[PDB]
């Protein structure tokens, strides 16, 4: 027969052990829930036991049976005869942890079987659904099945274990021969020194006024990460088509003037550089670009999961920019929409253990101040962005506002918020001809 | 008996249509493979046809039957009787691509059902696998379905294809640079240089404060497009009646003062000019005006489709303006209504392969800023307009705010967002007497 996977012996043993030894409730409470039991009487008994245990009362046989009787639910369980049978038949000398794990396991397998049956039934009767709708349904069902089990490993850990992990981290910091970079290499020496790269499981915000080079700087970071690493780099772009992204990348890598590329007025050396760049890019082949418009966090997460499944992991994720993303269920309030976007991005970064760099904009009123360098308060309408981001970097070019500027070709990266380090300004050289940022070679005070 | 999903008639239609018309083969080949066919004979027939098409031979009835008879496989298919049945039932009025898509869809449904059955059967028989192993197996099986599929026009593409597309676009632009007279002509030299005309499948927004000349500029663009093309030009004027629009058009084309036409104070030469203009317009007959108010996006799409069907295409669509359009299901929230309107307009523009220009208004706060030249943020409540538009132009006249302006008679079109080109300011001459914009003949900086 198509038997529903279950094991009554493990449940009966668990209940008998709990009746005999009231001190083991915790060892059972962290391995199984009431809904994890297969039969209605067992679930009912476990629920009553949880109520008694959290009300401060003993869970012996007579009190439990009497309490079930008082609520009129004693007959549904099976009676004082069945409760006494449970107490007696199961031996005291038992390993209840294995039984709790067994009860936990059958519930997951049974739910998997249930979802498979639901998928097949939905497949037989689509009811106007396309293949994409069916795939979305299947992915949603399996995700609900699998995700959130990880809360077992998340919680109050032992002091010794955390201390040993900290010692391992510090000794790995000491033993590594790198030049101050522990995460993904940003490609700039001073920024690498100040940030130790882009740390995995961190939310990174890149902010600037319009036309400051935000996309250019982000693409430079992407190119440097691709060149200096082996893991794939994924880009979500609601701002520009993929063709313009590739043209900018060619200009940046080949050091060829972007105006010439746009107008086609290239020369022999530029063609040679572009050929070399194309050869290198086709040799590496680790950059993926998605220029779809109107992205939602669910779509971004689904596509990132698909990429990670295809290639066994991600090294960095870049999104440009989050002011274009949509959350249809929260379209009424933009602040809630931004908060949901930020929370989902932070959760994704934590889950996949990758650095996520999301670009963002600032308010226009910043341009009306005496000093236009951004501050945290300049992130109005986006308080949750400031609250959730691990790192926040602002791009500032003085020549954008002043033609008289002595800092032509010089850009400032201002660290508005750093979770694990100092804050300040790092100067870089801006070559708008090649759409590139480079290390600042001038004197440093 | 649960019949799993199949349709013999669609398969028979595909095979028959390929038998009757061999030039459609490619369309079928890009939409279906031999494994998408439910019956063994249909798979065998498609395989034999694919081999014959690869060898260069025709795949008509007689050739296919002769090739099958040579290999001795004619009996497996069903015989010349079945081949003749396929030849007879399928008409020559075949849209084989739709049937091929249907075959593809059935295959996906079948694979999903089979995978669900496999997962459930694995659930009933763990064979020593742990819960994590079963969940990983289920996730891998379900995820493998979406591998490849149709993720070319509906997802991230291959980097090499995008690079080749960029190279081809650069070749097309550099080979024949005509300075903006390749797409829809705008009638202005500088605007053609900066925008390369009004590109088909692009959404164009024109915005300004009231009385700046938005309607005048839009009508000038419409007139230029109509005079410099042959395809119909359609106008959706929710702001003015068609009579006033036609009076302005007569004033512009005949270069007669608009106030004289409005008040009727015209002399003989003006009457001759107006008669000549009317004669030219009635000779051309390619301008259509709809002055209904409160139009929904569905009605706009329906009428645009009807015009394109009736007259074999469109060259430009103009809407004035989108603050008067209505979406009754979203009347409570203005932002959602504007987002829906912009999305529908973009979809229509992409579907009909025509430039769609939509006019919009700006908030009063612009008049309080130190610099009154419009910016994107002056499109308050219409972020979706900025997100979805391919081109965004703002109209600014300095003489409106300053009577002692040195730029009297000079208007600025500011490109706030261009998706496929640069941004900047284009100066034009404003002749309010004739309700006209003209090329700026003054010095250019």
């Amino acid at each position: 027969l198509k038997v529903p996977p279950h094991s009554i012996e493990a449940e009966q043993s668990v209940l008998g052990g709990l009746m005999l030894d009231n001190e083991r409730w915790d060892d059972v409470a962290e391995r199984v829930v009431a809904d994890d039991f297969y039969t209605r009487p067992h679930r009912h008994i476990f629920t009553e036991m949880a109520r008694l245990q959290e009300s401060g009362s003993p869970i012996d046989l007579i009190t439990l049976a009497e309490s079930l009787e008082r609520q009129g639910q004693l007959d549904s369980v099976g009676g004082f005869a069945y409760l006494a049978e449970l107490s007696k038949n199961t031996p005291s000398a038992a390993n209840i942890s294995a039984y709790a794990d067994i009860v936990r396991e059958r519930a997951v397998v049974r739910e998997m079987i249930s979802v498979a049956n639901e998928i097949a039934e939905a497949g037989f009767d689509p009811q106007g659904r396309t293949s994409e709708d069916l795939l979305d349904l299947a992915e949603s069902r399996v995700f609900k099945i699998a995700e959130s089990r990880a809360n077992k490993d998340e919680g109050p850990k032992n002091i010794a274990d955390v201390l040993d992990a900290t010692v391992a981290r510090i000794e790995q910091l000491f033993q590594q021969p790198h030049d101050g970079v522990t995460g993904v290499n940003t490609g700039y020496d001073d920024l690498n020194k100040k940030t130790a790269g882009l740390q995995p499981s961190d939310l990174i915000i890149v902010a600037a006024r319009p036309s400051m080079g935000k996309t250019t700087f982000a693409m430079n970071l992407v190119e440097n990460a691709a060149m200096l690493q082996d893991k794939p780099v994924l880009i979500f772009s609601l701002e520009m088509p993929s063709e313009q992204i590739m043209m900018r990348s060619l200009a940046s890598l080949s050091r060829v003037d972007q105006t010439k590329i746009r107008t086609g007025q290239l020369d022999d050396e530029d063609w040679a550089r572009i050929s070399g760049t194309m050869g290198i890019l086709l040799e590496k082949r680790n950059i993926y670009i998605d220029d779809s418009s109107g992205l939602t966090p669910t779509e971004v997460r689904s596509r990132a999961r698909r990429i990670a499944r295809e290639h066994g992991g991600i090294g960095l994720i870049m999104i440009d920019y989050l002011q274009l993303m949509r959350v249809p269920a929260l379209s009424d309030n933009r602040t809630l929409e931004i908060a949901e976007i930020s929370r989902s991005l932070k959760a994704l970064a934590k889950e996949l253990n990758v650095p996520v760099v999301a670009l963002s904009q600032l308010n226009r009123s910043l341009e009306q101040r005496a000093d236009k360098r951004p501050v945290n308060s300049d992130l109005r309408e986006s308080g949750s962005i400031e609250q959730d981001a691990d790192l926040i970097m602002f791009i500032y070019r003085d020549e954008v506002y002043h033609e008289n500027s002595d800092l032509k070709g010089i850009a400032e990266i201002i660290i508005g918020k750093q979770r694990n380090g100092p804050i300040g300004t790092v100067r870089l050289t801006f070559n708008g001809q090649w759409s590139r940022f480079d290390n600042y070679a001038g004197p440093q005070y | 008996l649960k019949v799993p999903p199949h349709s013999i008639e669609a398969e028979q239609s595909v095979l028959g249509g390929l038998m009757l018309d061999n030039e459609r083969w490619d369309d079928v080949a890009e939409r279906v493979v031999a494994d998408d066919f439910y019956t063994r004979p249909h798979r065998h027939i498609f395989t034999e046809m694919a081999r014959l098409q690869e060898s260069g031979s025709p795949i008509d009835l007689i050739t296919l039957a002769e090739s099958l008879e040579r290999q001795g496989q004619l009996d497996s298919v069903g015989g010349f009787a079945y081949l003749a049945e396929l030849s007879k039932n399928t008409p020559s009025a075949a849209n084989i691509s739709a049937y091929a898509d249907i075959v593809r869809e059935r295959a996906v449904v079948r694979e999903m059902i089979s995978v669900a059955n496999e997962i459930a059967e694995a659930g009933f028989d763990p064979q020593g696998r742990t819960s994590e192993d079963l969940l990983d197996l289920a996730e891998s099986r379900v995820f493998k379905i979406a591998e490849s599929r149709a993720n070319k026009d509906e997802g991230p593409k291959n980097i090499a294809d995008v690079l080749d597309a960029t190279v081809a676009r650069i070749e097309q632009l550099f080979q024949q640079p005509h300075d903006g007279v390749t797409g829809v002509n705008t009638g202005y030299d500088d605007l053609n240089k900066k925008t390369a005309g009004l590109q088909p499948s692009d959404l164009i927004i024109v915005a300004a404060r009231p009385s700046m000349g938005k309607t005048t500029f839009a009508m000038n663009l419409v007139e230029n497009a109509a005079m410099l093309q042959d395809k119909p030009v359609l106008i959706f004027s929710l702001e003015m009646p068609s009579e006033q629009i036609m009076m302005r058009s007569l004033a512009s084309l005949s270069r007669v003062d608009q106030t004289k036409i409005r008040t009727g104070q015209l002399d003989d030469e003006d009457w001759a000019r107006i008669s000549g203009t009317m004669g030219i317009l009635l000779e051309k007959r390619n301008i259509y005006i709809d002055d209904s108010s409160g139009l929904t996006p569905t009605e706009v799409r329906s009428r645009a489709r009807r015009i394109a069907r009736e007259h074999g295409g469109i060259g430009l669509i103009m809407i004035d303006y989108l603050q008067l359009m209505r979406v009754p299901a979203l009347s409570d929230n203005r932002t959602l209504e504007i987002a829906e309107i912009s999305r529908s307009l973009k979809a229509l523009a992409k579907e009909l392969n025509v430039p769609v220009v939509a006019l919009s208004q700006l908030n009063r706060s612009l008049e309080q800023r130190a610099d009154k030249r419009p910016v994107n943020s002056d499109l308050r409540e219409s972020g979706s307009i900025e997100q979805d538009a391919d081109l965004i132009m703002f109209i600014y006249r300095d003489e409106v705010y300053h009577e002692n302006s040195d730029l009297k008679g000079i208007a600025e079109i500011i490109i706030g967002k261009q998706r496929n080109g640069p941004i900047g300011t284009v100066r034009l001459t404003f002749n309010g007497q004739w309700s006209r914009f003209d090329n700026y003949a003054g010095p250019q900086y």
């Binding site: 290239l266 063609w271 050929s275 194309m278 050869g279 | 090499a160 080749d164 081809a168 070749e171």
Partner: peptide
């Protein structure tokens, strides 16, 4: 480079890098 020279260079690049699916 002119039109013909640019076309020849691009064709050489495509031949060196393959990508026969562009055509």
């Amino acid at each position: 480079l002119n039109r013909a020279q640019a076309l020849a260079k691009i064709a050489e690049i495509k031949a060196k890098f393959g990508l026969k699916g562009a055509s």
